[PDB]
Amino acid sequence: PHVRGANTRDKIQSVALELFIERGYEKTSMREIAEGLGITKAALYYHFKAKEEILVAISQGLGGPVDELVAWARTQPRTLETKREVLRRYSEALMGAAPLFRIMQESGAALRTLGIGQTLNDRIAAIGELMYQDGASVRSQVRISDALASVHFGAFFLSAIEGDPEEKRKALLESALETLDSSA
Amino acid sequence: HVRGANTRDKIQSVALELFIERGYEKTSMREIAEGLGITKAALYYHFKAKEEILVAISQGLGGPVDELVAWARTQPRTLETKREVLRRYSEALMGAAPLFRIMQESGAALRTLGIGQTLNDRIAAIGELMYQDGASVRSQVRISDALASVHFGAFFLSAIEGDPEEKRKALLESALETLDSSAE
Protein backbone atom coordinates (compact mmCIF):
# COMPACT_ATOMS: atom_id res chain seq x y z
CA PRO A 1 0.00 0.00 0.00
CA HIS A 2 1.51 3.27 -1.24
CA VAL A 3 0.33 6.78 -0.37
CA ARG A 4 0.27 7.47 -4.13
CA GLY A 5 -1.31 4.16 -5.18
CA ALA A 6 -4.81 3.03 -6.08
CA ASN A 7 -5.91 1.71 -2.68
CA THR A 8 -5.41 5.12 -1.07
CA ARG A 9 -7.30 6.68 -3.99
CA ASP A 10 -10.29 4.39 -3.41
CA LYS A 11 -10.04 5.07 0.33
CA ILE A 12 -10.34 8.82 -0.36
CA GLN A 13 -13.53 8.29 -2.37
CA SER A 14 -15.10 6.14 0.37
CA VAL A 15 -14.67 8.62 3.22
CA ALA A 16 -15.53 11.59 0.99
CA LEU A 17 -18.74 9.82 -0.03
CA GLU A 18 -19.65 9.35 3.64
CA LEU A 19 -18.82 13.01 4.26
CA PHE A 20 -21.01 14.02 1.31
CA ILE A 21 -24.01 11.98 2.48
CA GLU A 22 -24.02 12.87 6.18
CA ARG A 23 -22.95 16.54 6.11
CA GLY A 24 -23.70 17.53 2.52
CA TYR A 25 -21.63 18.10 -0.60
CA GLU A 26 -21.32 21.89 -0.36
CA LYS A 27 -20.64 21.73 3.40
CA THR A 28 -17.81 19.19 3.02
CA SER A 29 -14.38 20.77 2.62
CA MET A 30 -11.15 19.28 1.29
CA ARG A 31 -9.62 19.78 4.73
CA GLU A 32 -12.31 17.65 6.38
CA ILE A 33 -11.70 14.90 3.82
CA ALA A 34 -7.95 14.95 4.50
CA GLU A 35 -8.62 14.77 8.24
CA GLY A 36 -10.80 11.72 7.63
CA LEU A 37 -7.91 9.75 6.16
CA GLY A 38 -5.47 11.23 8.66
CA ILE A 39 -3.15 12.42 5.87
CA THR A 40 -2.16 15.91 4.73
CA LYS A 41 -3.94 17.97 2.10
CA ALA A 42 -0.82 17.56 -0.04
CA ALA A 43 -1.42 13.80 -0.04
CA LEU A 44 -5.09 14.37 -0.88
CA TYR A 45 -4.31 16.79 -3.72
CA TYR A 46 -1.97 14.26 -5.36
CA HIS A 47 -4.96 12.08 -6.28
CA PHE A 48 -7.68 14.75 -6.60
CA LYS A 49 -6.94 18.44 -7.21
CA ALA A 50 -10.51 19.55 -6.42
CA LYS A 51 -13.68 18.42 -4.67
CA GLU A 52 -15.54 18.05 -7.97
CA GLU A 53 -12.87 15.59 -9.12
CA ILE A 54 -13.73 13.32 -6.19
CA LEU A 55 -17.45 13.40 -7.03
CA VAL A 56 -16.74 12.42 -10.64
CA ALA A 57 -14.50 9.54 -9.54
CA ILE A 58 -17.35 8.28 -7.34
CA SER A 59 -19.68 8.31 -10.35
CA GLN A 60 -17.11 6.33 -12.35
CA GLY A 61 -17.09 3.56 -9.76
CA LEU A 62 -20.84 3.33 -9.15
CA GLY A 63 -21.46 3.30 -12.92
CA GLY A 64 -19.77 -0.07 -13.47
CA PRO A 65 -22.95 -2.10 -13.96
CA VAL A 66 -24.00 0.48 -16.57
CA ASP A 67 -20.79 -0.18 -18.52
CA GLU A 68 -21.37 -3.91 -18.07
CA LEU A 69 -24.88 -3.45 -19.49
CA VAL A 70 -23.57 -1.67 -22.59
CA ALA A 71 -21.23 -4.61 -23.25
CA TRP A 72 -24.04 -7.17 -23.17
CA ALA A 73 -26.49 -4.92 -25.03
CA ARG A 74 -24.18 -4.42 -28.02
CA THR A 75 -24.12 -8.23 -28.48
CA GLN A 76 -27.90 -8.51 -28.92
CA PRO A 77 -30.00 -8.81 -32.11
CA ARG A 78 -31.27 -5.21 -31.62
CA THR A 79 -34.96 -6.10 -31.39
CA LEU A 80 -37.78 -4.50 -29.43
CA GLU A 81 -37.44 -7.30 -26.86
CA THR A 82 -33.74 -6.41 -26.59
CA LYS A 83 -34.58 -2.79 -25.75
CA ARG A 84 -37.00 -4.00 -23.06
CA GLU A 85 -34.38 -6.07 -21.24
CA VAL A 86 -31.90 -3.18 -21.52
CA LEU A 87 -34.50 -0.96 -19.84
CA ARG A 88 -34.97 -3.59 -17.12
CA ARG A 89 -31.24 -3.98 -16.48
CA TYR A 90 -30.74 -0.20 -16.61
CA SER A 91 -33.35 0.21 -13.87
CA GLU A 92 -31.42 -2.38 -11.85
CA ALA A 93 -28.01 -0.84 -12.57
CA LEU A 94 -29.06 2.52 -11.09
CA MET A 95 -29.57 0.96 -7.64
CA GLY A 96 -25.89 1.34 -6.78
CA ALA A 97 -26.00 5.08 -7.53
CA ALA A 98 -28.85 5.71 -5.07
CA PRO A 99 -26.76 7.82 -2.63
CA LEU A 100 -25.46 9.81 -5.61
CA PHE A 101 -28.96 10.97 -6.59
CA ARG A 102 -29.56 11.76 -2.91
CA ILE A 103 -26.59 14.15 -2.98
CA MET A 104 -27.70 15.80 -6.23
CA GLN A 105 -31.06 16.59 -4.65
CA GLU A 106 -29.31 18.10 -1.61
CA SER A 107 -26.62 20.11 -3.43
CA GLY A 108 -27.39 22.05 -6.59
CA ALA A 109 -23.65 22.26 -7.21
CA ALA A 110 -23.40 18.46 -7.21
CA LEU A 111 -26.32 18.42 -9.66
CA ARG A 112 -24.60 20.76 -12.11
CA THR A 113 -21.13 19.17 -11.97
CA LEU A 114 -22.48 15.66 -12.58
CA GLY A 115 -25.26 16.52 -15.03
CA ILE A 116 -22.88 18.56 -17.20
CA GLY A 117 -20.08 16.06 -16.63
CA GLN A 118 -18.94 14.34 -19.81
CA THR A 119 -18.54 10.88 -18.24
CA LEU A 120 -22.07 10.64 -16.82
CA ASN A 121 -23.49 12.18 -20.01
CA ASP A 122 -21.66 9.52 -22.04
CA ARG A 123 -23.31 6.66 -20.13
CA ILE A 124 -26.89 7.69 -20.91
CA ALA A 125 -25.75 8.45 -24.46
CA ALA A 126 -24.47 4.89 -24.85
CA ILE A 127 -27.73 3.49 -23.47
CA GLY A 128 -29.66 5.64 -25.95
CA GLU A 129 -27.71 4.05 -28.80
CA LEU A 130 -29.42 0.72 -28.13
CA MET A 131 -32.83 2.40 -27.73
CA TYR A 132 -32.68 4.25 -31.04
CA GLN A 133 -34.96 3.12 -33.87
CA ASP A 134 -33.50 3.76 -37.31
CA GLY A 135 -36.67 4.18 -39.36
CA ALA A 136 -38.89 5.63 -36.63
CA SER A 137 -40.73 8.89 -37.27
CA VAL A 138 -41.04 11.80 -34.82
CA ARG A 139 -43.86 10.32 -32.72
CA SER A 140 -42.26 6.89 -32.27
CA GLN A 141 -38.79 8.32 -31.59
CA VAL A 142 -40.01 10.56 -28.75
CA ARG A 143 -41.85 7.69 -27.06
CA ILE A 144 -38.80 5.40 -26.94
CA SER A 145 -36.84 8.34 -25.53
CA ASP A 146 -39.60 8.92 -22.96
CA ALA A 147 -39.30 5.30 -21.84
CA LEU A 148 -35.55 5.64 -21.25
CA ALA A 149 -35.77 9.10 -19.66
CA SER A 150 -38.51 7.95 -17.26
CA VAL A 151 -36.18 5.33 -15.77
CA HIS A 152 -33.20 7.71 -15.92
CA PHE A 153 -34.78 10.52 -13.88
CA GLY A 154 -36.66 8.00 -11.73
CA ALA A 155 -34.50 8.40 -8.62
CA PHE A 156 -35.49 12.09 -8.40
CA PHE A 157 -39.30 12.14 -8.30
CA LEU A 158 -39.60 8.73 -6.60
CA SER A 159 -37.91 10.17 -3.49
CA ALA A 160 -40.90 11.38 -1.45
CA ILE A 161 -43.68 9.35 -3.08
CA GLU A 162 -43.97 6.33 -0.78
CA GLY A 163 -41.85 4.06 1.40
CA ASP A 164 -40.29 1.00 -0.21
CA PRO A 165 -38.12 1.82 -3.26
CA GLU A 166 -38.25 -1.70 -4.75
CA GLU A 167 -42.03 -1.49 -5.12
CA LYS A 168 -41.61 2.02 -6.54
CA ARG A 169 -38.76 0.98 -8.84
CA LYS A 170 -40.78 -1.97 -10.16
CA ALA A 171 -43.80 0.29 -10.67
CA LEU A 172 -41.73 2.92 -12.48
CA LEU A 173 -40.07 0.23 -14.60
CA GLU A 174 -43.51 -1.25 -15.32
CA SER A 175 -44.97 2.10 -16.39
CA ALA A 176 -41.90 2.92 -18.49
CA LEU A 177 -42.11 -0.42 -20.30
CA GLU A 178 -45.66 0.45 -21.37
CA THR A 179 -44.40 3.73 -22.82
CA LEU A 180 -41.74 1.73 -24.67
CA ASP A 181 -44.51 -0.49 -26.06
CA SER A 182 -46.29 2.69 -27.21
CA SER A 183 -43.69 2.99 -30.00
CA ALA A 184 -45.75 0.45 -32.00
CA HIS B 1 -34.78 56.94 -16.77
CA VAL B 2 -31.68 54.72 -16.73
CA ARG B 3 -32.44 53.74 -13.11
CA GLY B 4 -35.98 52.52 -13.82
CA ALA B 5 -37.43 49.07 -14.42
CA ASN B 6 -37.89 49.81 -18.14
CA THR B 7 -34.12 49.71 -18.63
CA ARG B 8 -33.89 46.62 -16.41
CA ASP B 9 -36.27 44.75 -18.71
CA LYS B 10 -34.30 46.17 -21.64
CA ILE B 11 -31.14 44.63 -20.16
CA GLN B 12 -32.81 41.22 -19.90
CA SER B 13 -34.26 41.42 -23.42
CA VAL B 14 -30.94 42.41 -25.00
CA ALA B 15 -28.89 39.92 -22.96
CA LEU B 16 -31.29 37.08 -23.80
CA GLU B 17 -30.89 37.86 -27.51
CA LEU B 18 -27.09 37.75 -27.30
CA PHE B 19 -27.21 34.50 -25.30
CA ILE B 20 -29.03 32.83 -28.22
CA GLU B 21 -27.09 34.24 -31.18
CA ARG B 22 -23.53 33.75 -29.91
CA GLY B 23 -23.91 31.79 -26.69
CA TYR B 24 -23.81 32.42 -22.95
CA GLU B 25 -20.13 31.58 -22.48
CA LYS B 26 -19.17 33.71 -25.50
CA THR B 27 -21.07 36.76 -24.18
CA SER B 28 -19.49 39.29 -21.82
CA MET B 29 -20.83 42.23 -19.83
CA ARG B 30 -19.11 44.67 -22.19
CA GLU B 31 -20.85 43.25 -25.27
CA ILE B 32 -24.22 43.47 -23.51
CA ALA B 33 -23.55 47.06 -22.47
CA GLU B 34 -22.42 48.00 -25.99
CA GLY B 35 -25.35 46.11 -27.52
CA LEU B 36 -27.79 48.17 -25.46
CA GLY B 37 -25.90 51.46 -25.82
CA ILE B 38 -25.44 52.38 -22.15
CA THR B 39 -22.31 52.49 -20.01
CA LYS B 40 -21.11 49.53 -17.97
CA ALA B 41 -21.86 51.64 -14.89
CA ALA B 42 -25.55 51.70 -15.84
CA LEU B 43 -25.49 47.94 -16.47
CA TYR B 44 -23.94 47.06 -13.11
CA TYR B 45 -26.50 49.27 -11.36
CA HIS B 46 -29.24 46.72 -12.16
CA PHE B 47 -27.24 43.47 -12.31
CA LYS B 48 -23.81 43.03 -10.72
CA ALA B 49 -23.08 39.69 -12.44
CA LYS B 50 -23.77 37.96 -15.74
CA GLU B 51 -25.46 35.08 -13.91
CA GLU B 52 -27.63 37.65 -12.12
CA ILE B 53 -29.18 38.58 -15.47
CA LEU B 54 -29.92 34.93 -16.25
CA VAL B 55 -31.71 34.59 -12.90
CA ALA B 56 -34.01 37.46 -13.86
CA ILE B 57 -34.49 35.94 -17.32
CA SER B 58 -35.53 32.66 -15.69
CA GLN B 59 -38.15 34.41 -13.56
CA GLY B 60 -39.47 36.38 -16.54
CA LEU B 61 -39.90 33.22 -18.62
CA GLY B 62 -41.48 31.52 -15.60
CA GLY B 63 -44.52 33.77 -15.76
CA PRO B 64 -47.00 31.39 -17.40
CA VAL B 65 -46.15 28.57 -14.97
CA ASP B 66 -46.70 30.85 -11.97
CA GLU B 67 -50.11 31.87 -13.32
CA LEU B 68 -50.83 28.22 -14.13
CA VAL B 69 -50.23 27.32 -10.47
CA ALA B 70 -52.58 30.09 -9.34
CA TRP B 71 -55.30 28.94 -11.74
CA ALA B 72 -54.95 25.25 -10.85
CA ARG B 73 -55.27 25.94 -7.11
CA THR B 74 -58.83 27.16 -7.79
CA GLN B 75 -59.77 24.02 -9.77
CA PRO B 76 -61.86 21.04 -8.59
CA ARG B 77 -58.70 18.87 -8.19
CA THR B 78 -59.84 16.16 -10.61
CA LEU B 79 -58.13 14.06 -13.26
CA GLU B 80 -59.40 16.38 -16.00
CA THR B 81 -57.82 19.34 -14.20
CA LYS B 82 -54.60 17.34 -13.84
CA ARG B 83 -54.69 16.82 -17.60
CA GLU B 84 -55.28 20.55 -18.13
CA VAL B 85 -52.39 21.71 -15.94
CA LEU B 86 -50.18 19.03 -17.51
CA ARG B 87 -51.15 20.27 -20.97
CA ARG B 88 -50.59 23.91 -19.99
CA TYR B 89 -47.31 23.19 -18.18
CA SER B 90 -45.99 21.87 -21.50
CA GLU B 91 -46.92 25.20 -23.09
CA ALA B 92 -45.19 27.14 -20.30
CA LEU B 93 -41.90 25.25 -20.70
CA MET B 94 -41.89 26.10 -24.42
CA GLY B 95 -41.33 29.75 -23.57
CA ALA B 96 -38.39 28.86 -21.30
CA ALA B 97 -36.73 26.86 -24.09
CA PRO B 98 -33.84 29.34 -24.66
CA LEU B 99 -33.07 29.10 -20.94
CA PHE B 100 -32.87 25.30 -21.05
CA ARG B 101 -30.72 25.56 -24.18
CA ILE B 102 -28.22 27.71 -22.27
CA MET B 103 -28.09 25.29 -19.32
CA GLN B 104 -27.52 22.37 -21.68
CA GLU B 105 -24.85 23.99 -23.87
CA SER B 106 -22.96 26.00 -21.23
CA GLY B 107 -20.58 24.03 -19.04
CA ALA B 108 -19.00 24.65 -15.64
CA ALA B 109 -18.89 28.41 -16.26
CA LEU B 110 -22.61 28.66 -15.47
CA ARG B 111 -23.48 28.25 -11.79
CA THR B 112 -27.15 27.25 -11.58
CA LEU B 113 -27.58 27.68 -7.82
CA GLY B 114 -29.63 30.81 -8.49
CA ILE B 115 -32.06 29.78 -11.22
CA GLY B 116 -32.31 26.29 -9.72
CA GLN B 117 -33.89 27.80 -6.61
CA THR B 118 -36.77 29.24 -8.64
CA LEU B 119 -36.89 26.18 -10.91
CA ASN B 120 -37.28 23.85 -7.92
CA ASP B 121 -40.03 26.03 -6.44
CA ARG B 122 -42.03 25.82 -9.68
CA ILE B 123 -41.85 22.04 -10.06
CA ALA B 124 -42.63 21.70 -6.34
CA ALA B 125 -45.74 23.86 -6.76
CA ILE B 126 -46.79 21.83 -9.81
CA GLY B 127 -46.01 18.59 -7.98
CA GLU B 128 -48.34 19.45 -5.10
CA LEU B 129 -51.15 19.83 -7.66
CA MET B 130 -50.55 16.48 -9.39
CA TYR B 131 -50.24 14.78 -6.01
CA GLN B 132 -53.14 12.50 -5.03
CA ASP B 133 -53.96 11.52 -1.45
CA GLY B 134 -55.96 8.31 -1.90
CA ALA B 135 -53.73 6.90 -4.64
CA SER B 136 -51.84 3.61 -4.53
CA VAL B 137 -48.09 3.27 -5.01
CA ARG B 138 -48.59 2.26 -8.65
CA SER B 139 -50.86 5.20 -9.48
CA GLN B 140 -48.67 7.69 -7.60
CA VAL B 141 -45.61 6.68 -9.64
CA ARG B 142 -47.50 6.96 -12.94
CA ILE B 143 -48.64 10.49 -12.07
CA SER B 144 -45.08 11.62 -11.30
CA ASP B 145 -43.96 9.79 -14.45
CA ALA B 146 -46.27 11.96 -16.56
CA LEU B 147 -45.04 15.09 -14.78
CA ALA B 148 -41.33 14.23 -15.01
CA SER B 149 -41.70 13.35 -18.70
CA VAL B 150 -42.96 16.84 -19.56
CA HIS B 151 -40.67 18.54 -17.02
CA PHE B 152 -37.34 17.14 -18.26
CA GLY B 153 -38.73 16.97 -21.80
CA ALA B 154 -36.75 20.00 -22.98
CA PHE B 155 -33.53 18.13 -22.09
CA PHE B 156 -33.85 14.51 -23.27
CA LEU B 157 -35.55 15.55 -26.54
CA SER B 158 -32.78 17.95 -27.60
CA ALA B 159 -30.90 15.35 -29.65
CA ILE B 160 -33.90 14.28 -31.75
CA GLU B 161 -33.81 15.98 -35.16
CA GLY B 162 -37.59 16.49 -35.31
CA ASP B 163 -39.45 19.78 -35.23
CA PRO B 164 -39.37 21.45 -31.78
CA GLU B 165 -43.16 21.78 -31.55
CA GLU B 166 -43.83 18.33 -33.01
CA LYS B 167 -41.52 16.73 -30.43
CA ARG B 168 -43.38 18.55 -27.65
CA LYS B 169 -46.73 17.41 -29.08
CA ALA B 170 -45.68 13.75 -29.13
CA LEU B 171 -44.18 13.85 -25.63
CA LEU B 172 -47.22 15.62 -24.19
CA GLU B 173 -49.48 12.92 -25.64
CA SER B 174 -47.28 10.11 -24.31
CA ALA B 175 -47.29 11.64 -20.82
CA LEU B 176 -51.06 12.13 -21.06
CA GLU B 177 -51.43 8.39 -21.69
CA THR B 178 -49.21 7.67 -18.68
CA LEU B 179 -51.30 10.11 -16.62
CA ASP B 180 -54.51 8.31 -17.61
CA SER B 181 -52.84 5.01 -16.66
CA SER B 182 -52.99 6.06 -13.00
CA ALA B 183 -56.80 6.20 -13.15
CA GLU B 184 -58.72 3.44 -11.35
TrEMBL record, chain A:
Keywords: DNA-binding, Transcription, Transcription regulation. Residues 6-66 form the HTH tetR-type domain. Gene3D superfamilies: Tetracycline Repressor, domain 2. The keyword Hydrolase does not apply. Residues 29-48 bind DNA. InterPro entries: DNA-bd_HTH_TetR-type_CS, Homeodomain-like_sf, HTH-type_TetR-like_transc_reg, HTH_TetR. One of its GO terms (molecular function) is DNA-binding transcription factor activity. The keyword Transcription regulation applies. PANTHER family: HTH-TYPE TRANSCRIPTIONAL REGULATOR BETI, HTH-TYPE TRANSCRIPTIONAL REGULATOR RUTR. This is TetR/AcrR family transcriptional regulator.
UniProtKB/TrEMBL annotation, chain B:
Pfam families: TetR_N. The keyword Aminoacyl-tRNA synthetase does not apply. It comes from Streptomyces griseoluteus. One of its GO terms (molecular function) is transcription cis-regulatory region binding. InterPro entries: DNA-bd_HTH_TetR-type_CS, Homeodomain-like_sf, HTH-type_TetR-like_transc_reg, HTH_TetR. Gene3D superfamilies: Tetracycline Repressor, domain 2 (1.10.357.10). Residues 5-65 form the HTH tetR-type domain. It comes from the Bacteria. Keywords: DNA-binding, Transcription, Transcription regulation. This is TetR/AcrR family transcriptional regulator. Residues 28-47 bind DNA.
